Structure formats: structure tokens, C-alpha cells
Structure 1
Amino acid sequence: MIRLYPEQLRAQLNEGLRAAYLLLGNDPLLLQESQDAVRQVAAAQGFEEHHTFSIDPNTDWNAIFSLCQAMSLFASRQTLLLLLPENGPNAAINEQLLTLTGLLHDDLLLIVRGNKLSKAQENAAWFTALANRSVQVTCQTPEQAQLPRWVAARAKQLNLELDDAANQVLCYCYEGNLLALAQALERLSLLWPDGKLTLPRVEQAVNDAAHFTPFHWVDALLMGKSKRALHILQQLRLEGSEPVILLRTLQRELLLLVNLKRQSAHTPLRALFDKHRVWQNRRGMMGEALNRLSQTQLRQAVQLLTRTELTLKQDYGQSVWAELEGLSLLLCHKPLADVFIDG
């Protein structure tokens, strides 16, 4: 199949529509834009029957009704949309979609939307059946270092100027949330018809609505970005993420840090990273952490995390969030927490 990027989706649809489009990714904005572009171009090329059909395991499975039957009124080409689950299809859904792709009209267009699918769902019979004709487009959130270029491109799309301070402010405020970023760019365009966005305007026209995942918090702690770490913890508190997920995501990397610091005094880091199965993007990260924090801070952090987990699963307390902030302070940065936040 064709694997494609959101920028080149316009060219791919322009050269010719394929049997089915699999638009996948974690962000809402790029998925929505790609789906809108596909729908508009299909309507230009003669697709009028548009169906939105959620896949989620429930009492909703009758998509076959819309494909086996030719349209009596007009020879109107149809478009079917599927909203994959938050974790992808299961085995039953895998085989059901395999049956769905077992028969498809040439005039029927298939749209599937969902999060990224690992190899477990990639090697399923449904995807392998789709592997010939369908075009899959990946839409992923640019990283915090990649956001400014994307914001500059979006500003050029709307004929806007932001200099650099406004770009940094927008990236910080709407980090990991491209939907709100595009909506805010539209809002700024509406606010000032001049289009010359500057700090004394974007400062008050912006929100704090941000999105995050525990990996961002763990990496912020590892680099020692104190303000970013506390910002992520506050945003996750507002979002209502499960504290246990944060606990486990930190615990994995903290156990890795403890073991690597234990082994550092005898073995070079090049062999240790290979033996411990560390990702290539994190090596330098780990290096910095190992060269920054001694085993005393690591043991204090382990004691703190142990107290946090025990008070979470035994006393049913609500002091978890402040305690994780204390751990953030005690991790790479300034270790004080004297008994106060050290058990």
C-alpha cells in the first residue's frame, strides 16, 4: 500500500482516487482536515452518499447494508466512514472488517479513522487484504521541537505574521493540541484583520488548554525542565488522568535509571545501553540524567515513589498529585524534600 503524509495527501487525491483511504493518527486536526479534503474531492468527482459509521464494540454493525445494494434513485457513488476504537480493532472486529473488505463496489469509497495500529493489528487479515489498493495516511502530532515550523506553515496558510515570540507562546500554550492551535489561529485572524500578530495581542487572545501524555512528563523530569514538568502535572490533573498510569510510567524509567547508575561504575555506557534495550532517541537523555543525579537522589526518589504508591493503594488518599509534584522537585533539579517529602 501507499504510506503517506498529510502534506502530500492533496497530490495523492489529485492524481486519482484509490479504492479506500485509511487515515490514521493520534491528532484530531490533521485527521479532520484529511477527511474533509477526501470528502470534498470525492464530491467533486461524483461521490454524494456519505455515511458516518462508528465501529466501537456496541450494538452498531450493519455497514454491509449500504454496500450490497445499488442506488435506485441515481447512480450516486457512496462514501463509508469507520471510527476505529481507542485501541484499534479486536480479533472479532478484525474478521468483521475482513468480511467488509471481502466485497467492495468500485464506486464505493471507504474511509477509516482511528489511532495508530501496532503490528498486532497491522498483520491482521483485514489490513493485509487492504494492503493492495488502499492508501494509508499517517497524521501525528509534531514534537515540541517540531511545532514552530508547523505553526509557521499554518500562519503562511492564512497569510499571517507572528515573528518568533508569538510562535513560542502559542507552542507552549497549545502544546500537544493542534486542534485548539488551529482554532486559535483562526480566532486571531478574526480578531485582527491586519493579520500582523504580535505578542501584545496573542498574549491575551490565547488559552492554557494543553494536552499531554505521561511520557512527556517523564522526559521533562529527565531533562530537568522544572517548569515544563510542573506544567504537565497540572495539565494532567485538570485532564483527570489516572495517577496510577503516571506512577507506572515514571517507575519504569526510574528503575532503569537506578540499574544504570548501579552498573555505571563498572561498565561503559555504550555496552550498558545495548544490554538494557534502550531506545536510540533516549540514549543522550539517559546520559544526561546519569551524569546529573547520584544514587542518593535516586534512592530518595524511590522511597518517595514507594510512599506515594502505598498511600495510593492503601489509605485511598488524595495527596497523590502534590506528592508527584514533590517527586518532580526531587528528581533531576534540586533535591531537598527533607523528610517533609521524603517519608
Structure 2
Amino acid sequence: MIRLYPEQLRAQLNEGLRAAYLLLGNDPLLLQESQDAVRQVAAAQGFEEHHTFSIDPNTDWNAIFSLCQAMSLFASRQTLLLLLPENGPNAAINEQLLTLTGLLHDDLLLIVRGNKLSKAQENAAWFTALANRSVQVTCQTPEQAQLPRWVAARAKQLNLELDDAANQVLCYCYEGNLLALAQALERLSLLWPDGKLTLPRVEQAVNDAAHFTPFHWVDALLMGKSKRALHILQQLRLEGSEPVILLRTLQRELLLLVNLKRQSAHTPLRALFDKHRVWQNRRGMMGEALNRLSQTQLRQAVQLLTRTELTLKQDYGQSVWAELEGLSLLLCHKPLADVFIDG
């Protein structure tokens, strides 16, 4: 079984076409690109017939088996596509896939899409049956460290010029959402035929800043930017961002900060960041908080966060925005009365 990345899929297809192709990952954009490339290559080879089905407990495998067995008078060279469940195949799905792999023909080109398979899922009869005649392409969203490389490559293949500041702004605004970033790049190219994308142009484009980025608010809190954090929180409130998502992100960051603060009384902050595999870009802002808030802070903040989380888990109150603003000022160097923290 060959293993590849999206960039090498085109080269592999140029070298030859294999019987089965597996697309496992959690990145819809890369999976769609790989599927489109494979289908285009198959159509060039003479595959003008395509079929797609969704795998679920209420699945009509009889139709698939009939299609595999049935021939075609003129429209030969069939292509079949399967969409696995998000959870993954079960024993019934395992045996169904084994039976389908048993009924394979040279004129049938099989494609499978789904999430990454675990060791138990990997160790399956159907999976091993295709080991000698299959290629799997891994398609997952890169981390922020590898994000700017991908952004630069995508801009380059579109015949566009991006400045370093513009690349950083694009990565910050569309972290974890490659589809939105690609759409933004396309819109920028449409706006400017010359293709020169300077920092002011993207900054004007960033004026949109639609929603879904509470990490910006959390980073503003970590940087001690009271004005920026308050503004971003207000924009999120206007956008109706799920307060639970903000609470969970700030909870992760605050737990990490509390652990670092407690264990840094005998260790340097940078060593602890290395221990926790923290990203250097984050390490900065985190450090600022760890160098801006005493141990008394990050404890009243923890109390407020825990009370708000319990209230939202039991009461589901919509006043969570005011509590979030209070916690925002608490995370800054503002003394705060400590009475608004219910203490």
C-alpha cells in the first residue's frame, strides 16, 4: 500500500492509475482537490461513468453489488465512490467492504473518503485485501507552524505576490479554516488584477473579519491588550459567536497558564514551554500573561471561569457575555473589586 501527500498525488497519477484510491483525513479542501484530480485523470483515461454512495446503517448494498456485477453495453469503465461514517466502519461495514473488495473488476475504479482510520480500523480484512493494490493520500489541516508555507505555495500557484506581513495577517485571520483562506485569496485576486497584494490591501480585506475566531480574543487577553480584547469581545457578541466555544478556548489557555505559573516558581517559563511543546508564537503572549498576572490572578480568573461554566452547563444563561467581559478585564492588569468575581 503506497502512502502519499496531496502534492505527490498528481505525480502518482501521471506515473499510473491504480485500482483503488483511499482518501483519509479531516481536511475537506484537500480531500475535494484529490477527488477532483483523480476523477479528471480517470475521465482522461476513459471513465465517463461515476457513482457515489454514502455509508450508513440504512445502506442498500444490493444496488452496489448489482452495479459491480452488471456489465455495460457501451458505457464501460465505471467509477464508484464511498463516503465512510464520521465514527468509522463497524463489523457489519467491515464485512460489507470485504465483500465489495472481493467483487472488484479492472474496469471499476474505487474511491473511498472518510476520517483517519485507527489501528483497530486499519487491521481489517478488507483493508489488508487492498494493501498490494492501493494508495492512500493523507489529507489533514497543517498546524500554524506549517500554515505560512502552505499559504505561500497556494499564492504562488495562483500567480500572486504576498508580503510577509500579508501572509502573517492571512494566517492569523484564517487559522484552521483553509477553505475560507482560499476563498479570501481568490477574492483578493479578483479585486486586484495586477496581483500585487500589499499589507494595506489585505488589512482592508480583513475589515470583514466575519466570525468564528474567538482565538483572536483569547490572544488579545494573553497580550494584555485590554482595548483590543474588549473590542474583539464586543465584535464577537455582535456576531453571536457561541459563548461556550469562547469559554472552552479560554479554559484551555487558562489551565495551561495556571499550570505554568504554579510550576515556574522553580523552572524558567521557556523550559516549561518546551516541556509542554508550546508553539513559539504562542509562547510569547502566554509568557506576557505569566509575566503580567500574579498568582492571585489566574485564581480569581479560574474561579470566575468555573462558576460561569457551571452556570452555562446548568442554567444556560445568556448573560455570559457580561461575565466574559468581566473575566477579560480580570485577565488584564486591572485590579477589579473582587466582588464582581463573586468573592
TM-score, structure 1 normalization: 0.76
Within the alignment, does 1:123 sit opposite 2:129 as a pair? Answer: no
1:204-240 deviations in Å (ceiling 9; x for gaps): 4557467869999888877879899889978987997
Alpha-carbon shift at residue 150 of structure 1 (Å): 1.7
Alpha-carbon shift at residue 159 of structure 1 (Å): 1.4
Which range is displaced more, 59-68 or 279-288? 279-288
Which range is displaced more, 83-92 or 278-287? 278-287
Residue 236 (structure 1) aligns with: 236
Alpha-carbon shift at residue 321 of structure 1 (Å): 4.5
Quick one: distance in 1 between partners of 2:238 and 2:59?
Answer: 32
1:81-131 deviations in Å (ceiling 9; x for gaps): 122333333443334333332332222212122233333433344434443
1:49-106 deviations in Å (ceiling 9; x for gaps): 1112122444555562354324322262121112233333344333433333233222
Alpha-carbon shift at residue 203 of structure 1 (Å): 3.9
Which range is displaced more, 312-321 or 225-234? 225-234
Could you say what secondary structure the match of 1:292 adopts?
coil
Quick one: distance in 2 between partners of 1:39 and 1:201?
Answer: 36
Quick one: distance in 2 between partners of 1:236 and 1:321?
Answer: 9
Residue 68 (structure 1) aligns with: 68
Mark the CA change 1:186 to 1:269 in structure 2 (over 3 Å): closer, same or farther.
closer
Mark the CA change 1:210 to 1:95 in structure 2 (over 3 Å): closer, same or farther.
farther
Alpha-carbon shift at residue 308 of structure 1 (Å): 0.8
Matched residues, number: 343
Residues 241-256 of structure 1: matches in 2 within 5 Å?
247=247
Residue 107 (structure 1) aligns with: 107
Instruction: Answer whether contact 1:176 1:212 (CA < 8 A) is retained.
Output: no
Which range is displaced more, 51-60 or 239-248? 239-248
Instruction: Answer whether contact 1:176 1:211 (CA < 8 A) is retained.
Output: no
Alpha-carbon shift at residue 16 of structure 1 (Å): 1.3
Alpha-carbon shift at residue 36 of structure 1 (Å): 0.6
1:239-286 deviations in Å (ceiling 9; x for gaps): 978655665666567556656755665799999999999999999999
Quick one: distance in 1 between partners of 2:238 and 2:168?
Answer: 23
Instruction: Answer whether contact 1:297 1:335 (CA < 8 A) is retained.
Output: no
Quick one: distance in 2 between partners of 1:83 and 1:284?
Answer: 42
Residue 23 (structure 1) aligns with: 23
Alpha-carbon shift at residue 291 of structure 1 (Å): 6.9
RMSD of aligned alpha carbons: 4.5
Which range is displaced more, 64-73 or 222-231? 222-231
Mark the CA change 1:117 to 1:9 in structure 2 (over 3 Å): closer, same or farther.
same
Mark the CA change 1:293 to 1:67 in structure 2 (over 3 Å): closer, same or farther.
farther
Mark the CA change 1:53 to 1:281 in structure 2 (over 3 Å): closer, same or farther.
farther
Quick one: distance in 1 between partners of 2:22 and 2:332?
Answer: 42
1:301-336 deviations in Å (ceiling 9; x for gaps): 321122112211333311235534544554587675
Mark the CA change 1:207 to 1:109 in structure 2 (over 3 Å): closer, same or farther.
farther
Which range is displaced more, 12-21 or 263-272? 263-272
Which range is displaced more, 284-293 or 156-165? 284-293
Structure 2, unpaired ranges of 5+ = none
Could you say what secondary structure the match of 1:211 adopts?
coil
Quick one: distance in 2 between partners of 1:333 and 1:79?
Answer: 62
Quick one: distance in 2 between partners of 1:166 and 1:264?
Answer: 35
Instruction: Answer whether contact 1:174 1:208 (CA < 8 A) is retained.
Output: no
Quick one: distance in 2 between partners of 1:68 and 1:309?
Answer: 53
TM-score, structure 2 normalization: 0.76
Instruction: Answer whether contact 2:217 2:232 (CA < 8 A) is retained.
Output: yes
Quick one: distance in 2 between partners of 1:83 and 1:231?
Answer: 42
Mark the CA change 1:56 to 1:19 in structure 2 (over 3 Å): closer, same or farther.
same
Which range is displaced more, 320-329 or 286-295? 286-295
Mark the CA change 1:171 to 1:86 in structure 2 (over 3 Å): closer, same or farther.
same
Alpha-carbon shift at residue 173 of structure 1 (Å): 2.9
Instruction: Answer whether contact 2:230 2:328 (CA < 8 A) is retained.
Output: yes
Mark the CA change 1:124 to 1:227 in structure 2 (over 3 Å): closer, same or farther.
farther
Instruction: Answer whether contact 1:88 1:117 (CA < 8 A) is retained.
Output: yes
Alpha-carbon shift at residue 186 of structure 1 (Å): 2.5
Instruction: Answer whether contact 1:212 1:232 (CA < 8 A) is retained.
Output: no
Residue 258 (structure 1) aligns with: 258
Quick one: distance in 1 between partners of 2:282 and 2:125?
Answer: 34
Quick one: distance in 2 between partners of 1:264 and 1:202?
Answer: 39
Mark the CA change 1:73 to 1:144 in structure 2 (over 3 Å): closer, same or farther.
same
Q: Between the two proteins, what is the percent identity of the paired residues?
A: 100
Instruction: Answer whether contact 1:21 1:110 (CA < 8 A) is retained.
Output: yes
Instruction: Answer whether contact 2:69 2:103 (CA < 8 A) is retained.
Output: no
Residue 142 (structure 2) aligns with: 142
Which range is displaced more, 187-196 or 285-294? 285-294
Which range is displaced more, 306-315 or 207-216? 207-216
Structure 1, unpaired ranges of 5+ = none
Quick one: distance in 1 between partners of 2:197 and 2:273?
Answer: 46
Could you say what secondary structure the match of 2:300 adopts?
helix
Quick one: distance in 1 between partners of 2:218 and 2:62?
Answer: 43
Instruction: Answer whether contact 2:224 2:288 (CA < 8 A) is retained.
Output: no
